[PDB]
Design a protein around this ligand. Structure first.
Ligand SMILES: OC[C@H]1O[C@@](CO)(O[C@H]2O[C@H](CO)[C@@H](O)[C@H](O)[C@H]2O)[C@@H](O)[C@@H]1O
Ligand SMILES: [Cl-]
Ligand SMILES: [Cl-]
Ligand SMILES: [Cl-]
Ligand SMILES: [Cl-]
Ligand SMILES: [Cl-]
Ligand SMILES: [Cl-]
Ligand SMILES: [Cl-]
Ligand SMILES: [Cl-]
Lengths: 159, 175
């Protein structure tokens, strides 16, 4: 369903834009082909409609839902305050803490796309397949989410 | 099921709803966080659901608390609970015109009273001024109730009494 996927992307972009300006730390993992059921069950179940508003309310500091991962599965916010594994990568910059290391860790054992907001700088990062793309612009964020979450790769790969 | 193995599914969902309300209101009350939670019963509240932001979410004390954090997108209005979901947040409810409602009470109390006049909803209010917990039902206000009185009214009004042995067997619902 192309329509739900474009809404998902917009919801991620607007919520992370708001948190970034406020240096609110956040972690959103979007499940793809590999199952994330065991990580979903570690958290508080929501099974909620996706909206930028609900994503922002989830991550407000010192609230019951903020301390852990949001996992998006199908067309729902499946859970909040979920556990994710921590990467032991030594290549990760020293100013990045356990949130970035959790995002990297999940990307190492799933094909999920994970978006991170830094509580120190408000920079936005992405992880995929054991790798981190640090401090992306608004345009780069949009381009990678469109490519990785909207199925309609139809054109020749070179482009 | 997910909730537990005792009694019927409906019973467990209703006891979880009650506990979710009690825990969330206790947390908000000590922080003087304003809150307004309306539980639909036999009366449709679909039109008020449509005024809010849709959530269609599993009920938890945690989600109720996060919804009402001040100065957030979801806090400004009513949560409406319908079936076994948090249907919407930041919904508009009608205001009561009653002059019998104390002027010391704010817009949340007047919205809670207003909905209770045209539905058989149970509505819970946390006052941002006093931290008191209030309840409305059928045009009446129960003001600044104790934890014990809150539990007693929620049990009576929100838990369907069901037969004992019949409750342990799950019925087929097409799945
Ligand atoms: O607990 C409130 C919740 O229960 C439901 C059924 O899931 O309502 C049923 O039980 C109520 C209280 O015992 C009754 O008022 C009602 O008539 C009955 O449908 C939900 O509709 C309600 O939100
Ligand atoms: Cl469409
Ligand atoms: Cl951080
Ligand atoms: Cl950064
Ligand atoms: Cl259950
Ligand atoms: Cl508390
Ligand atoms: Cl108030
Ligand atoms: Cl008390
Ligand atoms: Cl008491």
């Amino acid at each position: 369903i192309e329509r739900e996927q474009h809404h998902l992307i917009e919801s991620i972009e607007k919520s992370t834009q708001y948190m970034a300006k406020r240096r609110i730390g956040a972690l959103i993992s979007v499940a793809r082909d590999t199952g994330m059921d065991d990580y979903i069950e570690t958290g508080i179940p929501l099974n909620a409609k996706i909206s930028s508003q609900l994503l922002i309310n989830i991550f407000i500091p010192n609230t019951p839902l903020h301390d852990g991962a949001v996992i998006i599965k199908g067309n729902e916010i499946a859970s909040a305050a979920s556990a994710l594994p921590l990467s032991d990568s030594p290549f990760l910059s020293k100013e990045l803490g356990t949130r970035h290391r959790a995002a990297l860790g999940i990307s190492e054992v799933t094909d999920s796309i994970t978006i991170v907001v830094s509580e120190e700088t408000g920079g936005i990062s992405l992880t995929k397949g054991g790798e981190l793309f640090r401090d992306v612009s608004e345009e780069e964020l949009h381009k990678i989410l469109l490519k990785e979450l909207v199925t309609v790769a139809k054109k020749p790969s070179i482009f």
